[PDB]
Design an enzyme around this catalytic site. Sequence first.
Site, mmCIF file in Angstrom:
data_model
loop_
_atom_site.group_PDB
_atom_site.id
_atom_site.type_symbol
_atom_site.label_atom_id
_atom_site.label_comp_id
_atom_site.label_asym_id
_atom_site.label_seq_id
_atom_site.Cartn_x
_atom_site.Cartn_y
_atom_site.Cartn_z
ATOM 1 N N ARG D 54 12.411 78.566 22.603
ATOM 2 C CA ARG D 54 12.984 78.790 24.393
ATOM 3 C C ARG D 54 14.117 77.452 24.414
ATOM 4 O O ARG D 54 15.307 77.515 24.841
ATOM 5 C CB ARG D 54 12.651 79.139 25.362
ATOM 6 C CG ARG D 54 10.766 79.784 24.913
ATOM 7 C CD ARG D 54 10.023 78.496 25.031
ATOM 8 N NE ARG D 54 9.461 78.187 24.418
ATOM 9 C CZ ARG D 54 8.200 77.367 24.591
ATOM 10 N NH1 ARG D 54 7.755 76.794 25.966
ATOM 11 N NH2 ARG D 54 7.339 77.007 24.031
ATOM 12 N N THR D 55 13.670 76.889 24.881
ATOM 13 C CA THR D 55 13.866 75.406 25.619
ATOM 14 C C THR D 55 14.793 74.203 24.831
ATOM 15 O O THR D 55 16.054 74.132 25.532
ATOM 16 C CB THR D 55 12.179 73.953 26.030
ATOM 17 O OG1 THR D 55 11.503 74.466 26.614
ATOM 18 C CG2 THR D 55 13.266 73.414 26.521
ATOM 19 N N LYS D 84 3.648 58.095 10.973
ATOM 20 C CA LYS D 84 2.889 57.738 11.508
ATOM 21 C C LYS D 84 2.522 56.036 11.327
ATOM 22 O O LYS D 84 1.823 55.578 12.145
ATOM 23 C CB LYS D 84 2.076 57.937 10.091
ATOM 24 C CG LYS D 84 0.671 58.614 9.580
ATOM 25 C CD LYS D 84 -0.094 57.994 10.749
ATOM 26 C CE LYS D 84 -0.853 57.378 9.180
ATOM 27 N NZ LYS D 84 -2.789 56.952 9.298
ATOM 28 N N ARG D 105 11.403 66.599 23.862
ATOM 29 C CA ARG D 105 10.029 67.180 24.434
ATOM 30 C C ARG D 105 9.203 66.703 23.182
ATOM 31 O O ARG D 105 9.696 66.574 21.740
ATOM 32 C CB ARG D 105 10.726 68.700 24.113
ATOM 33 C CG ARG D 105 8.914 69.489 23.612
ATOM 34 C CD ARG D 105 9.810 70.397 24.673
ATOM 35 N NE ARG D 105 8.567 71.588 24.935
ATOM 36 C CZ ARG D 105 8.029 71.961 26.035
ATOM 37 N NH1 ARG D 105 8.876 72.196 26.932
ATOM 38 N NH2 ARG D 105 7.302 72.751 25.902
ATOM 39 N N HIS D 134 8.773 68.373 33.401
ATOM 40 C CA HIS D 134 9.223 69.190 32.067
ATOM 41 C C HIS D 134 10.872 69.859 33.272
ATOM 42 O O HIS D 134 10.767 70.784 34.159
ATOM 43 C CB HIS D 134 8.761 70.693 31.650
ATOM 44 C CG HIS D 134 9.748 71.605 31.480
ATOM 45 N ND1 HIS D 134 11.113 71.008 30.874
ATOM 46 C CD2 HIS D 134 8.920 73.136 30.636
ATOM 47 C CE1 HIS D 134 11.125 71.980 30.060
ATOM 48 N NE2 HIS D 134 10.201 72.935 29.632
#
Lengths: 310, 310, 310, 310, 310, 310
Positions: D54-55, D84, D105, D134
């Site tokens: 969605r974002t 890593k 994000r 957010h």
Amino acid sequence: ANPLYQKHIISINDLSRDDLNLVLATAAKLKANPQPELLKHKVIASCFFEASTRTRLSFETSMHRLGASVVGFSDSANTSLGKKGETLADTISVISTYVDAIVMRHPQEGAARLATEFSGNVPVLNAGDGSNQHPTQTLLDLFTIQETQGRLDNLHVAMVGDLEYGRTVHSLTQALAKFDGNRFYFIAPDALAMPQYILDMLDEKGIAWSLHSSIEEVMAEVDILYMTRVQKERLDPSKYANVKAQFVLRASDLHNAKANMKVLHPLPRVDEIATDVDKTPHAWYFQQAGNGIFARQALLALVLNRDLVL
Amino acid sequence: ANPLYQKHIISINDLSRDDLNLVLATAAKLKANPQPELLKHKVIASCFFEASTRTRLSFETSMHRLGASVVGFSDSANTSLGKKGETLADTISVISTYVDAIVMRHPQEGAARLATEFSGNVPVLNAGDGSNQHPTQTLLDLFTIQETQGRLDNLHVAMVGDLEYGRTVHSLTQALAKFDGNRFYFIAPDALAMPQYILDMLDEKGIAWSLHSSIEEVMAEVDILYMTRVQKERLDPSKYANVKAQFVLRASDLHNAKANMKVLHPLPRVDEIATDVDKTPHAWYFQQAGNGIFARQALLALVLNRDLVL
Amino acid sequence: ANPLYQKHIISINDLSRDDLNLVLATAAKLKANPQPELLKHKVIASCFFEASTRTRLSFETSMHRLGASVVGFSDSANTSLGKKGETLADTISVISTYVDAIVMRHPQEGAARLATEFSGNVPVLNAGDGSNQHPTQTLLDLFTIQETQGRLDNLHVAMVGDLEYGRTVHSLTQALAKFDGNRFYFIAPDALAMPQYILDMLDEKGIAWSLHSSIEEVMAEVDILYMTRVQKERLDPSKYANVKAQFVLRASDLHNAKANMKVLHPLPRVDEIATDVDKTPHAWYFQQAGNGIFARQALLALVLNRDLVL
Amino acid sequence: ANPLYQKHIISINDLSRDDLNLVLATAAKLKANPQPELLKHKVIASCFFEASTRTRLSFETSMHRLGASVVGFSDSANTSLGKKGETLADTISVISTYVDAIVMRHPQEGAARLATEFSGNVPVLNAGDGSNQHPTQTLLDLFTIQETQGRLDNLHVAMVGDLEYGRTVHSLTQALAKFDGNRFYFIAPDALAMPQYILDMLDEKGIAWSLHSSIEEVMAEVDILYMTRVQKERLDPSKYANVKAQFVLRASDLHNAKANMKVLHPLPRVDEIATDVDKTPHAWYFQQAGNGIFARQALLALVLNRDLVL
Amino acid sequence: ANPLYQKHIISINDLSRDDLNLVLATAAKLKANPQPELLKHKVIASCFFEASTRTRLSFETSMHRLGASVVGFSDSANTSLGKKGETLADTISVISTYVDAIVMRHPQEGAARLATEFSGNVPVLNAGDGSNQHPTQTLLDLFTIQETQGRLDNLHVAMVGDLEYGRTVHSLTQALAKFDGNRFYFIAPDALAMPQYILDMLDEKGIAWSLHSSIEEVMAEVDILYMTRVQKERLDPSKYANVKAQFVLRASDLHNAKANMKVLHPLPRVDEIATDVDKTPHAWYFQQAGNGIFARQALLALVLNRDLVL
Amino acid sequence: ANPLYQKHIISINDLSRDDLNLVLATAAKLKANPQPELLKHKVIASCFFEASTRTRLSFETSMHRLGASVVGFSDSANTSLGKKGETLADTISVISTYVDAIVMRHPQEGAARLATEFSGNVPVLNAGDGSNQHPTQTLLDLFTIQETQGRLDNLHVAMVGDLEYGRTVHSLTQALAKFDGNRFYFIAPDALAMPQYILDMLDEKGIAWSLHSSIEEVMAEVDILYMTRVQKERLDPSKYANVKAQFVLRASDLHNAKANMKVLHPLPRVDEIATDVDKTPHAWYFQQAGNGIFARQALLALVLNRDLVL
């Protein structure tokens, strides 16, 4: 020695009628009078390259019941490209130096036979090699029929379901054909009818057989009704529902059936036998399953113990 | 015959006090003087539909200790159904024709009881059925308490941890309540307190109980401290750290504790008991584990062997 | 008591020459004259935290051959690098209260040794701890060499393959170095040569050794040719094919070899030994495997049974 | 310049009442008359170290609507615990020589902030940093409130659901509290109350807030009703037990709402808002979601375009 | 035309000194004055059969900067060993009817070359073909050297790290050797020396090279210091043992470098370059990476735009 | 407006013959004379809930070719549950506020149609909904046939393979049946014949059709030979090999074929078409694939652009 001492048990077709009776007699003896120390000191390998829990449990129970020791393994869907490293041959080559007999089950056909070629004097017993053989299933089937009808000749036998892929009934048909006066009825959705080479084999032996399309046509006059397990992938899901309801058995289909008749099924079932037949005198599939441990005890006894005590 | 011969063992609540003592006495007898051939010639089925290695090991050891033969299987999480085809009922219907008793562990509650409805005269012993029962864990708990205190009545017992989900302590509480003069102390992070119907049952029987929030308040005066295993998912990870340090036990929390007190834990533990308590005379969780094979021997012995030799 | 009664068997380096002979003598006795009730009433735990079916089968067969009862488990990809709750210590702490000996195989090095620190008076036998030890493999190797050459001194021994990662040959080298007059030949693709500390140890003992690059150079004059298993990941797939064909053995490489020489391989093999060598008198890797159950019987027998009957 | 040109937008708590206004003003401007060529020739990185569809769709659409080109990646259930070796810092040091802005994000609180320390002159926009911030979610919330109410002062706002963890409701409350005269109404399942720092904050600013247990108390007075999203592990079957329905908002609950009342939910919703409210004039969560492209266009416009003339 | 119009760029070894120069000239031109509409209306496929995020982001950004549209896919740990049926050739045969150029990366050496045999008139650009070639990485390396040194002749270049497998250092050495007067300095952990074909190539062209074991020897004389990336399985804990620090370059190691000296590393780096060198004027690996978009713009420009006027 | 402006494209059966021609004519126009700015300023959502890379690539290329912007996602094996939280409906409810059209592919049948019910005035184009529809595949198939035969009526069309599961041919059959004079030939292994309702539909329209069992019978007289892809799971691996060699096509099967005939295949193929047919004038499957971008351009153009420029 008895005929089967130290022999490999790979295929139903490798057994005479004499052999069959020998196995079945021993089964009946062992069932009447257990010998929990017949195989004391023997070590059997339970090698399930392809997992089959109902099959392993039965066989391993048979082994303990004779006092034998058990080692083995169940394989995990296989993995990527098999055991990958080890050839099956190498595997048997090694195991045959640990143990006194091998019971194996494998996804490739012929695997059992192959094992015999690397197992030395260690006998192997086929517990299922892909779509080829499963002899103890047939033997347990035979024993069950004989016990309940008192005879293996002149019987009225129905086969029902996926008769094209159903190796269980092929084998049982083949072995019942080494007997006289028997009469078959085949019940199938048309595009799943019984493979021809069998019928050819049946006509050639003079064996009465009739193709039908519903259980009803014959229910009144059979001694054994042996059901196999029709799949939801094999036939597609539109044609399935349109003809599914005759390859399903309810108690209400048993009104005109003989008082000697038993319904058999190698198991497991899903919906092909409604649970309401369970309570009737005809349901014998669990009994049948129980007989597996005598068929399998018999075989292990005959193979590993040079002279039998009836 | 003894009261338990040929009976199913499904739920702690199905046992009298008489029953419990019968089991515990047999445990003590067997621990003192082994009978490695009591169940010679029996074949038991170890059916773990839900894997539990600490449980299977214990139970199967018990079986070999009595000289019984063991067959079985551990199931593999869930690709989807472990079974799909076979109803549990059918599965028991079959296995109960192979074996002399069934020990099963299953993810659904009531599965063991269901089995009894298709196992014929084959006894089944519940080794865990979802979040319902685990009787041998309770019985091993009981035996462990009695052995170390000399009695099961008038005792000071602490329960610590996830008292809302911890079925281990519910059961132990229930069975200790069939005894007189006992006094409980419940230690929990508030939103995890002991389910009420338990307390209702306790008030109704006249059982002294006190809710607390730290071990310290009571440490000085208990005979048993039984710890359960608080999770990192159940409480969240912010409230966890803020109150975690009292549901953790260190040796330094044992300065004022009684010389008869033993710390119990069904196992496994993670951090709830620091390893420094291991070396103290109070740590008894490993001992407790060991007693498992006696509780379980006793049960198998009583069930399968008509008259007991104390 | 014999020197090994109630002792842990963790590392080859923990054994004297005396010890080795003691094991091998017992192996030979047991092979000649079986004692299927030596460990009657013992219960052994077969704990494979890391699955290894060829290893478990061998070991568990040894156990049943001595009449011992067996319980255990095989772990499933040690999924990650541990059981997330239980410390290994706790696990042994518990198991050592159920059983009479522990046979364990584990991905971490030192795991066997750690177990000894929590197992009480229960002996543990290391069946492989990561890349550290595997003593029964070495013992089976030793036994196999001695049986076929009649002696463990003044022998011409070849090692072939991945000598840098091949712990099998390290151990065998170390233990053959507790014997006199022995002469080694190491065959390896250069960037996989035998670790130095080994050679340092060899020079320091006055042990004749020669580094070579093809089997041919020496074939004519060795008594044992011991092959390890070169990987398709360790060397890359371009350099592999360019030098692969000398770390592969065909029957045609055996024209000038000694009539006493035996080819060994811990197994399994993939392509490093062509199947055409199987039929020759030199192939002894399957024999070797079979000897595993005597090396392993010997060790269990010595450890669990205070005085040996040769 | 404009106050936000070349700034990072990392946390709501870094933005003044003016800043907030500027964003919202711009948003509305762009919403009214589009500038599809405002960021022609910009390339923006859409770095979704943590997948959130969605974002990402929202943000990317905004970039395209302003004419910019987009490159990036959504990330995955990370095999072996990450890139890593590669630090986030090296990742941002590199990516920031390619592109003109970074929208990112990340599963770790503080990731956006760390990026700025390596991004050079490239502004980074926080699209979610673990449970921290957010900002665009909050800005689209504010924008929806302002657009439908005509204002951000003198409102009656109710927050509903998990107030302990609803990072949406913390942010939104902080923001609205940069404005005069709002009054708040908090409604939780007793459990999961509001963080004390927020309440303390309201008190110093001198802002009215009331606690409540159902929406009924408050429904007739509110202008916004903001629902949080509510997890399966956030709560349990035991605290969904007697009062779980106000946790389920239904059309019937809305009979007495002011005509202007809108219901916002940051989405997705699972069962907490019944679909029959969807048809009411109060349902505004889908509209809310589409406003996200304006809040986001606005931020990107202001941050990349020196002087933004409406 | 221009010499590279409509050509494939598969391998460094296919490119003349002039070709190299053309690319680098173009790169610089574009870097100086952008042409964001040069490939307007082209559509390029970004086919990443093997995931490589750093490489894909760079290439895609370049396409966008030149105004082209991008479609494609990054691939995944392949379930069941691939598209399995679908040949790469079928894949390229289809894709090459959609798009104007193919930029592809593939786990198999030779994939880019095979693509051209099915691509028709659509140029394919190699983005990595297993361990074979990576031309743009090499071109961005050359471009960075040229940009900072003013030249590609008469340089003093040191390669450091895994020289056996450093495909980056093989390529770069090959290219530089198309130029006059360069002198080379190779530095390995003894193990992992340079491929003999490279050295043999240098000797024919008459080019000075020296072998060394630490950087100290060479630091005062070098113009470029190029570090390879170095894996955990490429090396081990045992050969990280006495000399592993020259494998860790630190700011302190740079005291006597010429002022002009740049440190390049193709990235990512794990520990081989300490973060304290980041601040030195010598650190140029991030700048290096950003130069990739020019090398790559250049290639794309030249290959798709008939006559590229600077 | 044109008939298709702002209409959802879900199922082939929702289109008249007029519609089909309209799409195909637009395809041809766009192929002859590109309109790279037709959809400038549109933003399309490429929503692949079930991954299909050949399908996504084609469709996304179509969008860029018309100058549209593209946003979207490919889902990852559906992750056991699917999306778990979000209902499909909610997902469409949201996305339809971001974008100008939706192209979706989904594992459940009817998912596209469902979307239309929540997408407002945003058109959705079905890119595959389980085993139901895939209209752009049919449309590209149709366009390809027409281009190469000059007409869509009075044609001789062969279908080959898995005609029971092969939805590609069902659809093509259905749509070709909206044309006159066409004649079909169905080639299948018996238990995979063409579903009846199709034939019923054909008889009812007066459509000449003939069931055959080998390509040869008809090769001499067909205009289109359209092959589907027979599976290794559908038929079992014993019957497979016994009849496989006629559902495989080699160049040598093309000796007597018409000079207008083209071989079609939706792709991908595995072994069902040997690579030697690729070079012949009949192979047209790659061409067919190319036509996908014009079928798909046409559709997007007609749907989002109110009046068409031919």
